[PDB]
Point group: D2
Chain length 317, copies 4
């Protein structure tokens, strides 16, 4: 039987017997994602170039408006907005959404892959909506994932029962279920990070990457990959295995990536696929935020590889 994202979400909703508010959220999110992809692939560009005589701003506008009009959300935290967004009373619902509307849109001049990342939280108190409702630990996530605008457009959706991958067919505007319940390899052969920052590496990271290149035994050295776009680099790790690092050093003791709308959804997708995601000191999903735009270090991927990193990291503790 053929399966779409919309058919998938309704069947899970009927199993759980909810009211439908979460499904209205996800459907709005898919629709916004399809409009973003259309703009990213440059539909209608000939008109700007004079046939008859902004991209991340538009992206944030498509996601914002579609969520407000869903009548299912109450607080929206975005990489584009300095303060959290409070939905007006007439359009209010019960969910909290943290998103990066166009991850990697800084290097979009080289036609690099870009993506939309989201984490969806349930609102905990009945107090007036405010920023405090987005300050939950990654363990509290209801669902999370990302859109990859790569050679094709794919939506990866993680929930309690696991991770599923959907492919956008642009002829009809439908996400097609193509990979059910994916699990990451127990141990990989690729390591992923920016080695240009070598002089600033934490001493454990230095040794761990050295062990990937010069094994003390006779194993094969690892290969290396780094796109510079999180949605792309993390998605390769899921599909091929290996380790992804944007770690802490003395210059950025808390890392560079934002915890809420980058680190948490990817940590969630990883753990639901059998992987791990750590800061070195603790699991990313266990961190309690105190600011919506706060940073977190992250090392994620295959479990044997993260354990091997934690072994070196603790050796230097």
């Amino acid at each position: 039987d053929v399966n779409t994202l919309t058919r998938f979400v309704m069947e899970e909703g009927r199993k759980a017997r909810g009211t439908g508010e979460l499904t209205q959220l996800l459907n709005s999110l898919c629709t916004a994602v399809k409009a973003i992809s259309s703009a990213v692939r440059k539909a209608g560009i000939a008109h700007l170039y004079g046939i008859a005589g902004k991209l991340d701003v538009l992206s944030n506008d498509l996601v914002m408006n579609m969520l407000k009009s869903s009548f299912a959300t109450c607080v929206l935290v975005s990489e584009e907005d300095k303060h959290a967004i409070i939905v007006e009373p007439e359009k209010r619902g019960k969910y909290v959404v943290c998103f990066d509307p166009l991850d990697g849109s800084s290097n979009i001049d080289c036609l690099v892959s870009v993506g939309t990342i989201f984490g969806i939280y349930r609102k905990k108190s009945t107090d007036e909506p405010s920023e405090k409702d987005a300050l939950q630990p990654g363990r509290n996530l209801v669902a999370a994932g990302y859109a990859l605008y790569g050679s094709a457009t794919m939506l990866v959706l993680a929930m309690d029962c696991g991770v599923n991958c959907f492919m956008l067919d642009p002829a009809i505007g439908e996400f097609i279920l193509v990979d059910k319940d994916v699990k990451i390899k127990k141990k990989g052969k690729i390591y992923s990070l920016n080695e240009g920052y070598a002089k600033d590496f934490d001493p454990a990271v230095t040794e761990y990457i050295q062990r990937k290149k010069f094994p003390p035994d006779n194993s094969a050295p690892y290969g290396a990959r780094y796109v510079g776009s999180m949605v792309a680099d993390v998605h390769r790790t899921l599909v091929y295995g290996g380790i992804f690092l944007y770690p802490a050093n003395k210059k950025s003791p808390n890392g560079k990536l934002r915890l809420l709308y980058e680190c948490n959804p990817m940590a969630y997708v990883m753990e639901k696929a059998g992987g791990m995601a750590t800061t070195g000191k603790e699991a990313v999903l266990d961190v309690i935020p105190t600011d919506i735009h706060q940073r977190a270090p992250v090392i994620l991927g295959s479990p044997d590889d993260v354990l091997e990193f934690l072994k070196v990291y603790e050796k230097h503790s």
Copy 2:
């Protein structure tokens, strides 16, 4: 005024007052690229998954058929085909085409950037056509370039008078002139290579990469990017500046990339944009081929960055 790819090539053809055989070729190749892009973006994939009840092989078949049926070619070399292709007598024209129909289609499961790379030669010998007609050095190219199937679909077109970039507008299926007479930065700040082969690196490469991480003049360290797909890495280098390296290792004593339909078209675009491309001993475009699938090492990019590598290279004899 709006300019398209077809209008651009027709304008250049009347300037040159040629017959139009090259125009029919370029038009045929552009049609093949618009077809491949539609396949890479998964248009119509919903039917494969039963809505009504290989990709690089297809890419190879689309480029093969459109070039044959243009009546403009006589020898065709492809990464998918073990031997060169001899075009039948009724469809022969005066040009020779070397192409990789879907470069990077190995990592196409991680939705990595993929692309089509091509190089165009006027047949040189008057002999009956054979594989020897594709063994010309890259200096002899009439035109060269690539389609990058990234976040959007772009065609980069290089010729004697320079490099032009066209953006595919899928709404109307037309390439739109968006970057006229493009030039690479004189010097960049990103380096690109697979550091997993560090244990097999030649001493010259070992030293040059050391200089990128720990600069001797206390300048800021370069950043590193490595997609693992040549079309993406080169286009990022072209759009931003910097250096791209795939040198030899123990597994590849003659280097890894293919000279005919990977290294040379990229050497041509670089030099036509003001960049450089070397193997260490000589310019890639100066290499005289003896076998159609032969390998070459390559270091290319911004002119100041490649000169700095060769300076280190001659230090080690």
Copy 3:
């Protein structure tokens, strides 16, 4: 606020808080409509014509497979099938759907307008399903409507509270609501029928056409339009006003158009918009079918015009 067809159906579905089975139905039907439209507009025709080396049949297969796999249907009557289709046990649900997957596709060689017409009924008995579940009169319709593949693709959806029109935006694959709670004019200025059949006209129709061309009270005469595809003509009647006639004559005492999947869903749309639809003797919606493929004559449109037709009609006994 922007509204899509999917948002419209879920919000109405939550208004009634039904099980979700009818929503899973309409979502599947909408998905088939987008697929038909893409093939009707000739997406991918280059592959059929050998770029790398039926339409009503595919249309019927898309609607059949998408409805079966919705788990919301058990009996399906289609213009393409001699007998009704009984859904297999594991996929049986509670709704009955009548559809013409591609109305007017015989004249598709002149690129005339084509359309999909559908009506949805509820299962009548709790016994095992059979054809009798589709032999309901039009008065029982839960929903009905049509897609018009014209200069654009529009979905007109009629239900208890009235009729709404949605426009397919092909860039993103979403139906956008453009006309809310539509009503036809009380009286129009256009009549629509095949006047080449003048020789077989009932005396009443002849007189009614006489008064439109030569008004006895010197009002201005009506204009004439006749496309020859029912979905197109009916939609023109709704948008501009007037009357559409395919009536009974001595040769076809029961008309030409089919009652289940052409006449009934169109009569339903008209009445829900403030119009009328008659066979001359009674309302179309009051007709009891005895065979899934039985015919009925139809006169529909503006209320003053249907009454003026019946006025002449009753004078002639």
Copy 4:
């Protein structure tokens, strides 16, 4: 072998060993036809209805056709249904051709999603005077090429020239016109007539009789069927594809007809003849009328050759 319109035009242009001006012309028109098609299909309508928080279609269509032709460097006078006076292309962008076009015919009923179309006729500039409006006052006999885009259930381009008529189907996945029907010819005699019978009370005595013969044939053969979409491009292309007759004739209230000679009557007549059909005004051939005004009207009766002749026989009985 697969054939596209761009490949087809480059091949014919190379046979004739021309300069390339006419191919650059048609290529610009094909692109204008694809942008119009994309707009008529309502791509991007979600932005007009507030999905993220303009021009009428005939204004955009006329702007698209105008801009692409000027920028082709192949034209010098442009007559459009939208513009009162002829347009003289500025000196730096002048070429040798004159184009009379209707950019979106039938766009009045576009609210009922009726078929719409683009009609065009191409002339070479004849005189060596500085270009002016008079350069468009040539009779239809002078056409280099003519045709139409029909934005119907699919988008098709019909191109007529000296050697005949060819049809291309737009594949929107790649944006290419694909040659699908080569060298079309209309049937010698059809079974469909096309005109607005609602205005019967003003009919000329012959048109009354001819339509009388089609509904109640004197030889008791089967009657013709009637079709009238109300949009010229859809109706005429149906005539070409299936045969029959299309009529918009003269009456006492409109002695010169309603349709315009330059950008409606002549291009449809030209396509008809190059496919084996006829097109007449009753008194003379459409292609033989010498205009004195670029927006002057003409009656037109066109379609299968045998069907048009039966009209002219009735026409002359009434002198």
